Amino acid sequence: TNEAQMAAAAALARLEQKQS
Amino acid sequence: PNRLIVDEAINEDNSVVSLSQPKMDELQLFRGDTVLLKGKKRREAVCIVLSDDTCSDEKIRMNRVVRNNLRVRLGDVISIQPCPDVKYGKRIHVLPIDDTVEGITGNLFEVYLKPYFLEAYRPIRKGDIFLVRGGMRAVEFKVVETDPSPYCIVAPDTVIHCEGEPIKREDEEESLNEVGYDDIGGCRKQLAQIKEMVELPLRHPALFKAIGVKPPRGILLYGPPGTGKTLIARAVANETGAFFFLINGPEIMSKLAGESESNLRKAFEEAEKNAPAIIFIDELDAIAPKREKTHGEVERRIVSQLLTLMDGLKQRAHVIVMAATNRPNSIDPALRRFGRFDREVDIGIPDATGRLEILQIHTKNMKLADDVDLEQVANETHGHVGADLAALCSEAALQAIRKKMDLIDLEDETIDAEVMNSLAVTMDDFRWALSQSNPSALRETVVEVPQVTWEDIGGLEDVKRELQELVQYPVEHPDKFLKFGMTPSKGVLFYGPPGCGKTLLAKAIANECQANFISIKGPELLTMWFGESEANVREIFDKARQAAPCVLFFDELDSIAKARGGNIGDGGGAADRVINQILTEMDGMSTKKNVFIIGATNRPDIIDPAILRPGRLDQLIYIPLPDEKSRVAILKANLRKSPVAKDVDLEFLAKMTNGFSGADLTEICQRACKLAIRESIESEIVPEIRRDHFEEAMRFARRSVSDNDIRKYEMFAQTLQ
Amino acid sequence: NGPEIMSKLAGESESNLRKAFEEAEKNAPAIIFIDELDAIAPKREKTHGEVERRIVSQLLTLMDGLKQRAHVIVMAATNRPNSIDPALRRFGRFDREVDIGIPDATGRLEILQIHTKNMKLADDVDLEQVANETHGHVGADLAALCSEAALQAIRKKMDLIDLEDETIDAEVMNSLAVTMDDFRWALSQSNPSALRETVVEVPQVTWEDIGGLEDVKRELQELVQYPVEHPDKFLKFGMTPSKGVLFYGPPGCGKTLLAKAIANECQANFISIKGPELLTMWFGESEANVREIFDKARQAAPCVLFFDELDSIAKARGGNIGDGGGAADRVINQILTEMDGMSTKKNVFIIGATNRPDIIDPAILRPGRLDQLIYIPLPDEKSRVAILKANLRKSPVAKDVDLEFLAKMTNGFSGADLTEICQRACKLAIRESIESEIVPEIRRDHFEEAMRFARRSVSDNDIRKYEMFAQTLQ
Ligand SMILES: Nc1ncnc2c1ncn2[C@@H]1O[C@H](COP(=O)(O)OP(=O)(O)O)[C@@H](O)[C@H]1O
Ligand SMILES: Nc1ncnc2c1ncn2[C@@H]1O[C@H](COP(=O)(O)OP(=O)(O)O)[C@@H](O)[C@H]1O
Ligand SMILES: Nc1ncnc2c1ncn2[C@@H]1O[C@H](COP(=O)(O)OP(=O)(O)O)[C@@H](O)[C@H]1O
């Protein structure tokens, strides 16, 4: 649902900050 | 169904679990969807699933926080299912653990929970444990009460509460600040090797006692002090759950006769009662040194007592004894015989990548300023081990603390969390700490995969290909060598003028092959010759075996022949003490150890011909002075990192420097850089290296290899036909 | 065992050792096995403690008590016969010795077969190939090798079936096959405990592997076999059998193979002493180690003790010009001494080889030493063909390869030089084969290209040097 999609954007952004 | 093996995670984020794309389609979930994980004792955790290019298809990668919430350990199997109906919450009540908040006071929400939860959209379940780092402390929290149940996602408008006494830790719940695998930086290859040896008999004891195959009983870890020998032993016990019993030399040797032997025996009895168990014996050389080095009754008895206790491990099922020493040959050789301590792992010294990982680990709780560059530090910390990098981070932290504490002047029994949380450690504090730190492994042998790649070597296109045939093919295509009855070469000798890239060639092939590079330089061969200590060659070749796969490079192979007079020489022949030991070790080395020997000489006419016979350095490659197209490539490689102005014509320089070696072109590059630096410094009392700087450099740079020496190499190459 | 006795206190170690002998007598016939004997009764010169001195004396008296303790035999294990109190080895006590040594390629295969009896092996597993690769291993290492290969196979299946219970399913293990990849992995992890030990074994080189030299093959049989196959004729005619022969001639002509092939046909242990070992003793002033080499030859008898590069020291001393001294040196003098003290009744035959006979200490050529000298010339045309066929015996050579024409071209080549051609052509075939996957045989083109680089290593100036020496000897 939409709360999972908002968590998806936040989790993906933190992953990119750690990988970069 | 949907049962996957629990693996280690790369992403430290407590709300993120990694699954390989094919499992996202089997589970019919989208990237970033929220899933539940089913653990043990009717427990579960909620997390967000992301994809990467490293997770194994059949594994789920989760960190320590998630595994503890599920009460599972690495190697177990858990179930994963989507839960697309997860909703947001309005109220979450979080309290700290009593065993982690001590000596520190302040507004826990503003410091820890607010940046953790705010706009993070984390899934939370009732009873979850999670860790928030900051202010140079690692503070773990438990979630006790929420409005929705059993789980929800925190929204930007969710209110976080924290009232009540700290929570007493449960006896079956391990602290997140205990030593685990994520506390170990470099030496990942050794940790993986050890895990394979120990995790199987410790996690699945029913396997070994039910089959005719016996487990490893004793593992000896060796390397310089401060490299993580104890850190690994603790991480293994804490991750598998085996009972950990600590032994150390000083504790046993400080006891009187009749007490030291008794206490050592008790340690083995306690491990058996608590089996599966690991007995870690640190400073083993202090308990059971080589017999030839001791004559006391107490030292002789404790050697015999340890040997009998190690042999008793045939009955003490599921007990593994690990030991730490500085050198595998400092202890009674009996310990290393079949059984007892018959497995060995060389921990070594972290390389530039491992040192960066260690610095990142020991700064997890530290707030770093934007100017801090830990990769730059890792490159400067040559000769340091993990213990020194930990001290380096501590000293940098204390320098930052002093600067602020002397200004705020707040003296009390506890520290304000906000004061530490807003304290940033700058690059100046790390640079200061680097000046104060003193590496403990400065004179130790450096064994690492070289950072030199083929792009760093100009010209020599045919030599690059030849090395790939000599080094990679024998192990990438072994069935063709067997098919045709070919005996792979054990090594190659490079000869030619100095400064033409002979060293880079050996490093670059070691890099592409991801093999450890061991550099032996002229002064080391001369030291062994002059000091009549050629026996040390055996330790060099044995280190190559220990570090395999590796490339063992002997530079300045003629250094001794020249020290003996070179062009005229002395009363003897070509053979000498050190080269003879090198010949002996090569003859006893098999190609199955994946150790490739490379030599280099600037005077092939005085190399003991024995080294060129079949079975030794039978291949010979000539490295000439670079031609015009190569000299341009060399200039570009040497200037790859320099701010060269667009007006610099590197092709014109290559045309002028007709007789120059690669090293001579480097002098031009560095001399021009020096001139640019001088002008830049003067302008403050410039943004790029200008044509004028290279033109002035050409006024001093000269070829180091004369035509008389070029013919010497050509005549040798002609002799080889 | 040493650790069990030495871990005890003064008054307990001696008592427990005495009890062991009393128990064996009560249960006679009995065998007392003392492992790590060097830990109980080391050479006296190496210890001064009262406990170590007493336990040496106590063991000596208990061994002497075996005159009354009927039917009790005491066996002991040590690493070296000279690491223990020499008194133990005097008449009586421990007056019999057996040298166990290190298993050879055949023995290693047998050990691998023994420690896999319970293992299910896949069709791709080749234990003979493993036995040939496990150089320097002892039985303890091959046992660990099989264990590691088993565990790698087990992990691969156990992580997939996920069956966790108190007992193991017999069907699961019974259907688990250990593949060659698991043995190869285990070989990479295994680390031999005897890597630097002296290798003493019957060589796999046979006469079929040596091209040419038909007359030398016959001569060596007369020198090595006749003194033991027909000893009654040597006594009848008052003949003193030769104790050894020196090979001389150009390098790479088969001098080493000749020594191995005769050792093989005679089923005798071959002991190889290479140039670097003679130089190591000279450089380090440790020529005393020659006594242990000749003593090993006695222990391993019947055997052939081969001293390669006998001139290695003479060359290290300047060779063509030399230094201020004469032909004699530290290492050769110890070799001369040991040969003089060696009897032909031990069935130990000494063979030397040199590439520079003009600088060999003439003492080694006197009666009683290496009095026989055999010249090994460069191979002639018919021999070079035989050499090519021998070197290519295991290679997939195409039918279009004309080895007789190749032998005609390589007129001045040594046997080692013909091998370089064979291996260089193989390398070219391998390179092409690997490229075809990114070929089934070695084609004429590969040998023709090899001839572009292969050269004779022995010049005419060096051939005459050997001819002049051979002419002097008639
Ligand atoms: N590879 C490593 N990764 C992370 N920390 C390390 C590593 N090696 C050493 N350290 C750190 O250095 C110290 C090593 O001390 P310890 O494990 O007790 O070693 P020793 O056995 O020499 O006493 C610890 O603080 C540990 O965290
Ligand atoms: N082919 C080349 N490409 C790039 N740089 C080179 C080349 N040859 C020499 N150099 C420069 O010369 C320096 C010395 O090279 P090196 O191989 O270490 O010399 P040697 O092998 O004689 O010790 C290197 O630092 C490198 O920058
Ligand atoms: N007569 C021969 N028959 C077959 N191969 C030979 C012969 N002579 C030399 N070779 C080849 O040359 C190589 C070196 O021979 P070897 O006897 O070891 O030389 P050396 O005795 O000078 O050390 C051997 O591997 C062998 O393949």
Author numbering:
A (entry chain J): 49 to 68
B (entry chain D): 23 to 707, 728 to 763
C (entry chain E): 270 to 707, 728 to 763
Sentences from the paper on this structure:
p97, also known as valosin-containing protein, is an essential cytosolic AAA+ (ATPases associated with diverse cellular activities) hexamer that unfolds substrate polypeptides to support protein homeostasis and macromolecular disassembly. p97 forms homohexamers that enclose a central channel through which substrates are translocated and unfolded; each protomer consists of two AAA+ ATPase domains (D1 and D2), an N-terminal domain (NTD) and an unstructured C-terminal tail. UBXD1 contains three conserved p97 interaction motifs: a VCP-interacting motif (VIM) helix and ubiquitin regulatory X (UBX) domain, which canonically interact with the NTD, and a PUB domain (peptide:N-glycanase and UBA-containing or UBX-containing proteins) that interacts with the C-terminal tail. Here we identify UBXD1 as a potent p97 ATPase inhibitor and report structures of intact human p97–UBXD1 complexes that reveal extensive UBXD1 contacts across p97 and an asymmetric remodeling of the hexamer.
A prevalent class, termed p97–UBXD1VIM, closely resembles the previously determined structure of the p97 hexamer bound to ADP (p97ADP, Cα root mean square deviation (r.m.s.d.) of 1.0 Å)36 but features additional helical density in the NTD cleft of all protomers that corresponds to the UBXD1 VIM. Cryo-EM analysis of p97–UBXD1 incubated with ATPγS revealed three predominant classes: a UBXD1-bound hexamer similar to the ADP-bound closed state, a symmetric hexamer lacking UBXD1 density with NTDs in the ‘up’, ATP conformation and a symmetric hexamer similar to p97–UBXD1VIM. Despite the unambiguous presence of ATPγS in all nucleotide-binding pockets, the NTDs adopt the ‘down’ conformation in maps containing UBXD1 density (the closed and VIM-only states), indicating that UBXD1 interactions favor the NTD ‘down’ state and appear to override the ‘up’ conformation observed in ATP-bound structures. We postulate that the symmetric VIM-only class in the ADP and ATPγS datasets may be a consequence of our incubation conditions involving a high, 2:1 concentration of UBXD1 relative to the p97 monomer. We predict that this results in saturated occupancy of the NTDs by the VIM helix and displacement of other interactions that define the asymmetric closed and open states.
